Design an enzyme around this catalytic site. Structure first.
Site, PDB file in Angstrom:
ATOM      1  N   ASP A 124       0.855  -1.229   0.113  1.00 38.29           N
ATOM      2  CA  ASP A 124       0.034  -0.033  -0.059  1.00 38.29           C
ATOM      3  C   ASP A 124       0.822   1.274   0.002  1.00 38.29           C
ATOM      4  OD1 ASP A 124      -2.493  -1.215  -0.027  1.00 38.29           O
ATOM      5  OD2 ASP A 124      -3.040  -0.520   1.797  1.00 38.29           O
TER       6      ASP A 124
ATOM      7  N   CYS B 135      -2.477   0.721 -13.385  1.00 38.51           N
ATOM      8  CA  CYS B 135      -2.611   0.581 -12.128  1.00 38.51           C
ATOM      9  C   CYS B 135      -3.979   1.551 -11.528  1.00 38.51           C
ATOM     10  CB  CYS B 135      -1.252   0.892 -11.611  1.00 38.51           C
ATOM     11  SG  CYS B 135      -0.432   2.608 -12.036  1.00 38.51           S
TER      12      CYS B 135
ATOM     13  N   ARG C 109       3.286   2.470 -11.026  1.00 34.84           N
ATOM     14  CA  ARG C 109       3.485   1.185 -10.920  1.00 34.84           C
ATOM     15  C   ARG C 109       3.642   0.877 -12.339  1.00 34.84           C
ATOM     16  NH1 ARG C 109      -0.539  -0.886  -6.314  1.00 34.84           N
ATOM     17  NH2 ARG C 109       0.098   0.710  -4.787  1.00 34.84           N
ATOM     18  N   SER C 110       2.605   1.436 -13.311  1.00 31.77           N
ATOM     19  CA  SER C 110       2.950   0.929 -14.656  1.00 31.77           C
ATOM     20  C   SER C 110       3.919   1.432 -15.514  1.00 31.77           C
ATOM     21  CB  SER C 110       1.327   1.684 -15.488  1.00 31.77           C
ATOM     22  OG  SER C 110       0.339   1.246 -14.920  1.00 31.77           O
TER      23      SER C 110
ATOM     24  N   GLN D 154       6.460   7.897 -10.481  1.00 35.32           N
ATOM     25  CA  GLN D 154       5.957   9.033  -9.612  1.00 35.32           C
ATOM     26  C   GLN D 154       6.678   9.371  -8.464  1.00 35.32           C
ATOM     27  OE1 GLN D 154       1.994   6.934  -9.135  1.00 35.32           O
ATOM     28  NE2 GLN D 154       1.187   8.773  -9.420  1.00 35.32           N
TER      29      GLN D 154
END
Ligand SMILES: CC[C@H](O)[C@@H]1N(S(C)(=O)=O)[C@H]2CC[C@]1(O)CC2
Ligand SMILES: CC[C@H](O)[C@@H]1N(S(C)(=O)=O)[C@H]2CC[C@]1(O)CC2
EC number: 3.1.3.48
Length: 284
Positions: A181, A215, A221-222, A262
């Site tokens: 998370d 994502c 994440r992508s 990010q």
């Protein structure tokens, strides 16, 4: 510089934030006018994450052709990817319309439906064989065929039917279920194992349309997934694998979608994944 020793040099000097901010400063800025039209407000999950006009995927519809999705075309590596946000309640039919129209074999999902106690994307695929889904706005039917649950990821076989023509296709759903998370994984080993399973399926290969990867926003994440895949492929293709420059590859990818990677922690994790992955390829 090479990668593994540039890596240790940034760790010892603690300058990951400065490296990452340089990337943010040099990244491309292209218009995203279609994304910001008022009629598309409920088609975007986040107001600050939009596809560029020049690379956006168009739906084959005359009313409204907009979806929050971008085509990332990597010329030297000879790989293409579609990066998109997690589907919203009012875009699940558009999502599957795109999969159909672009002839994709695989969908890669890097988030859970709920994270941090909040919904990160719609439940857009069926969970039981006998309870199929019908998307009336785009005239598609989606059935769960089989499911294989492993410790770090789940693979599902799905049948997508175009109800207008009665054509059917098999779609593979690759769901990475264990990204934490907060932060990034401590080891890249399970993420690399997952990447290799997607590769082995054919979903990334030229005989199919581009893989669809998402994502929640479709940039963090992508971005890590396609950056690692492309860097490893270039290391296999070139005479000198130490010539692969992960920052330059990332900036090339950011010509096609804003914001890929990010955080500085995601940047460091991408380096780690490529470094470890290059040892296993040898080839070991
Ligand atoms: C404290 C947050 C920083 O971004 C840290 N940097 S840092 C300072 O440059 O070392 C890297 C990546 C993420 C991090 O928490 C761990 C090492
Ligand atoms: C060639 C695209 C199709 O016409 C699409 N279908 S579909 C997938 O065949 O059911 C309906 C009508 C228009 C459409 O773009 C979106 C929903």
């Amino acid at each position: 510089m090479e990668m593994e020793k540039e890596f240790e040099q940034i760790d010892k000097s603690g300058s990951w934030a400065a490296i990452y901010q340089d990337i943010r400063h040099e990244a491309s800025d292209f218009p995203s006018r279609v994304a910001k039209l008022p009629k598309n407000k409920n088609r975007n999950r986040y107001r600050d994450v939009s596809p560029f006009d020049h690379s956006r995927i168009k739906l084959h519809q005359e009313d409204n052709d907009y979806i929050n999705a971008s085509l990332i075309k990597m010329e030297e590596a000879q790989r293409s990817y579609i990066l998109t946000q997690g589907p919203l309640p009012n875009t699940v039919g558009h999502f599957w319309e795109m999969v159909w129209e672009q002839k994709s074999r695989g969908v890669v999902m890097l988030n859970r439906v709920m994270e941090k106690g909040s919904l990160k994307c719609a439940q857009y695929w069926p969970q039981k064989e006998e309870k199929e889904m019908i998307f009336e706005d785009t005239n598609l039917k989606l059935t769960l065929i089989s499911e294989d649950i492993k410790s770090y990821y789940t693979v599902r076989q799905l049948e997508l039917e175009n109800l207008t023509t009665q054509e059917t296709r098999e779609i593979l759903h690759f769901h990475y279920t264990t990204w934490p998370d907060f932060g990034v994984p401590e080891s890249p080993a399970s993420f690399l194992n997952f990447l290799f399973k997607v590769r082995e399926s054919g979903s990334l290969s030229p005989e199919h349309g581009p893989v669809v990867v998402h994502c929640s926003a479709g940039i963090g994440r992508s971005g890590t997934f396609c950056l690692a895949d492309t860097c490893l492929l270039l290391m296999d293709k070139r005479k000198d694998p130490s010539s692969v420059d992960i920052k330059k590859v990332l900036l090339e990818m950011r010509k096609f979608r804003m914001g890929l990677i990010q955080t500085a922690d995601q940047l460091r994790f991408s380096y780690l994944a490529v470094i470890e992955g290059a040892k296993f390829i040898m080839g070991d």
